[PDB]
Write a protein that binds this ligand. Structure first.
Ligand SMILES: CC[C@@]1(O)C[C@H](O[C@H]2C[C@H](N(C)C)[C@H](O)[C@H](C)O2)c2c(cc3c(c2O)C(=O)c2c(O)cccc2C3=O)[C@H]1C(=O)OC
Ligand SMILES: CC[C@@]1(O)C[C@H](O[C@H]2C[C@H](N(C)C)[C@H](O)[C@H](C)O2)c2c(cc3c(c2O)C(=O)c2c(O)cccc2C3=O)[C@H]1C(=O)OC
Ligand SMILES: Nc1ncnc2c1ncn2[C@@H]1O[C@H](CSCC[C@H](N)C(=O)O)[C@@H](O)[C@H]1O
Ligand SMILES: Nc1ncnc2c1ncn2[C@@H]1O[C@H](CSCC[C@H](N)C(=O)O)[C@@H](O)[C@H]1O
Lengths: 340, 344
């Protein structure tokens, strides 16, 4: 039993395996193989790497079962195929060290400082805090928006169906990304108009995305800062995966700006985790919660915490709806908040 | 569609950087030792590790999720069978090997730049810590000492089998080049009372070899010399040992080291290499092999070598591989080998 406990511990503690996975995604190793380069010299050329070092990386990729080896010819496994760039779960991009998230994940190398201080480590590594770093790096800004929106044609169908749009005229989507939630509601409730509030760079991609859905006459995009007064009032105000980016004091500020922008009868809709789930759900949550810590100083929140957050902003949680996810099996929640 | 959820889970697990950093953080904070020393509540534990209670609880939740800790009473956390291996006195020493303040786990941060190493073939350690590996240790006595203690963590038994894998009947003197704390020299000395030995090592390490050999009662049979194995060796020997030295070096340096050794061999002398006669395997052997080979890459620009590579290295130094013995390990289930080289 000790040999077994020992193998398990060494596996769990190993840094080399996820960096090998991320290296392979970054070099688009699987895409090139699927595009014919099954040999070492050809793969090394396409990835622009040394053939002997590439071979040493490939060896571990075989050991963990992402690839398998005719002699000197390698093919992806079923698991390996998920690193193809056109796979629906987009795992290649999520593991790509040149794109925003896997890049930010380096913050985990300073996890002890984060546990010691409760403060994010991203800045100590990259020179500026997360959104400020992206603000100065249009490549990262763009890749971040594409990752979060990787699923946007379907990801917002369930939450949009979980709210009654009958007496809503206007929706404001605060930090709404490329506008996917706004678009989903528009398709569902054609009498509804919307505004998306977003940061520089992102607003241009939102405008394009919405124009390409044919929604340009129904959803506006405004460039702004949701710590400042909101650009207009609305019957529903949406915060989809925004509040987990912020520590309690900032999250209360954001909620306060939303409450002040609400029309009479209006509601604020928080789309996130109502944090609790099973053994596979639990590791998504622990990973996302710790990401928020090291990237941003944010956190996932239980219902008891939402209740306190709501009250501090003069709000109350009116109801909570649990929602299935379509591309990755994870349970999400829509919280509906009303003035207290 | 169950097989697709299956594959997606596997990939996400294999790709995850947070899990090994959480394991390393637990080891560095000595979390499991404090728990075993009485601190089961978060408040108590946060105090002993000098961390913030709410953030520690978030770390602990992943530690429970991956099966390193369990909550037996509310707010009370205890280690599982797997978590117990992080107690500081467990024989495999995995706490220390995962401690981010100690040399190896600290060095493992070099993997965050693995793409550079695959592109260039060069180590990334220096780009991160400002100096190459052995120079960085030369300037940081704390890191030098923890490195030596990691490599020697089972030295009492780690060298018994290689020492018995060679006949000492006609050996008078042994030189152990880069011999660490002297453990190999000591195993041979216990096995063959007629043999005397010299350990050649770097600054800092020589003090702890000297103390270790003294404390084995071997002071009058094994001495220690501070020196550089790229320079002429301090004396001639019948057997010269390179134990986990050559894998730290690229071929051109490995050939220089072997050449210094060949020049210092008495007539009929042999060079003994203790390392891996590497081969592609199926068992869990393969993930130890790949981790070690890739560490040597990103830390040092070194590598594990197959028999064919060993043959080439030896010929370049005017040597030939005469025999290879497979060796059982006593602590970690990983087969090693002893290569015996002679003048070509
Ligand atoms: C892989 C699961 C999930 O996609 C859930 C979750 O992603 C879900 C919902 C997400 N959302 C836009 C609806 C999208 O549909 C995605 C494909 O699936 C999630 C993830 C990751 C992030 C985030 C996630 O929300 C973030 O929000 C996030 C952020 O807001 C700022 C910085 C970084 C991140 C994230 O890294 C993912 C996660 O939990 O990984 C452990
Ligand atoms: C965990 C297995 C092993 O202990 C084998 C291997 O450790 C073996 C042999 C080692 N040796 C002194 C005989 C000792 O008995 C240890 C407990 O078990 C090994 C390990 C690691 C290193 C090294 C290893 O040799 C190094 O040599 C090394 C180095 O020379 C310079 C920098 C770093 C390292 C290492 O990180 C380990 C390894 O392969 O991890 C994947
Ligand atoms: N001060 C600020 N003002 C406006 N938007 C901000 C902001 N700080 C961060 N954001 C935006 O908040 C978003 C969080 S992630 C976007 C989530 C999106 N609602 C979705 O569910 O897909 C990012 O797009 C980021 O650009
Ligand atoms: N130029 C040099 N001269 C002498 N020793 C060196 C050296 N460069 C590295 N070393 C030593 O080589 C060793 C590699 S690890 C030592 C392993 C030890 N022989 C064992 O089997 O446990 C380190 O102790 C390091 O101090």
């Amino acid at each position: 039993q000790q040999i077994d406990a020992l193998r398990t511990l060494i596996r769990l503690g190993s840094l080399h395996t996820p960096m090998v996975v991320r290296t392979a995604a970054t070099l688009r190793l699987v895409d090139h193989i699927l595009a014919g380069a099954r040999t070492v010299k050809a793969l090394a050329a396409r990835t622009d790497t040394r053939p002997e070092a590439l071979l040493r990386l490939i060896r571990h990729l075989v050991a963990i079962g992402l690839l398998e080896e005719a002699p000197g010819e390698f093919v992806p496994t079923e698991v390996g195929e998920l690193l193809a760039d056109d796979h629906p779960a987009a795992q290649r991009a999520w593991h790509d060290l040149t794109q925003a998230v896997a890049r930010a994940d380096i913050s985990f190398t300073r996890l002890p400082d984060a546990i010691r201080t409760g403060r994010p480590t991203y800045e100590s590594i990259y020179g500026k805090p997360f959104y400020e770093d992206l603000a100065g790096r249009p490549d990262l800004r763009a890749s971040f928006d594409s990752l979060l929106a990787c699923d946007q044609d379907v990801a917002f169908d369930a939450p949009a169906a979980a709210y009654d749009w009958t007496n809503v005229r206007h929706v404001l989507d605060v930090g709404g990304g490329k506008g996917g939630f706004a678009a989903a509601i528009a398709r569902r409730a054609p009498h509804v108009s919307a505004t998306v509030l977003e940061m520089a760079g992102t607003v241009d991609t939102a405008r394009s995305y919405l124009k390409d859905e044919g929604l340009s006459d129904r959803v506006d995009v405004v460039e702004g800062d949701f710590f400042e007064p909101l650009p207009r009032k609305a019957d529903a105000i949406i915060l989809s995966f925004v509040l987990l980016n912020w520590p309690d004091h900032d999250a209360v500020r954001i909620l306060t700006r939303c409450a002040e922008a609400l029309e009479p009868g209006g509601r604020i809709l928080i789309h996130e985790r109502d944090d609790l789930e099973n053994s596979f759900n639990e590791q998504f949550s622990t990973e996302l919660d710790l990401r928020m810590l090291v990237f941003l100083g944010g956190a996932l929140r239980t219902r008891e915490k939402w209740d306190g957050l709501a009250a501090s902003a003069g709000l109350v949680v009116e109801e909570v709806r649990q929602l299935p996810s379509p591309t990755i099996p994870y349970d999400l929640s829509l919280l509906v908040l009303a003035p207290a």
